[PDB]
């Protein structure tokens, strides 16, 4: 029951710098983008009804 390891895993996790990505739209534009992704086009679907963040 020692207190010596208190920031063990966070301390030893290899730091990875965040990428430089483009700014996202905000407000009405972001909602329009969501509406276009979800209801207007069916591009990414394979007919199998997967999720938006499916990696398989």
């Amino acid at each position: 029951g020692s207190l010596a390891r208190a920031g063990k895993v966070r301390g030893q996790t290899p730091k990875v710098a965040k990428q430089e990505k483009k700014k996202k739209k905000t407000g009405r534009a972001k909602r329009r983008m969501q509406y276009n992704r979800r209801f207007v086009n069916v591009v990414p679907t394979f007919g199998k009804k997967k999720g938006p963040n499916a990696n398989s």
């Binding site: 199998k48 009804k49 997967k50 999720g51 398989s56």
Partner: peptide, 30 residues
């Protein structure tokens, strides 16, 4: 990856909720 039998041999394991959710997503996708 197939939800149908994933649910048939994972519903007792740690992954019951995920495979159940995927199987229901296949069945009624909207």
């Amino acid at each position: 990856t197939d939800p149908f039998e994933d649910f048939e041999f994972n519903c007792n394991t740690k992954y019951s909720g995920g495979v159940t959710r995927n199987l229901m997503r296949e069945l009624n996708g909207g």
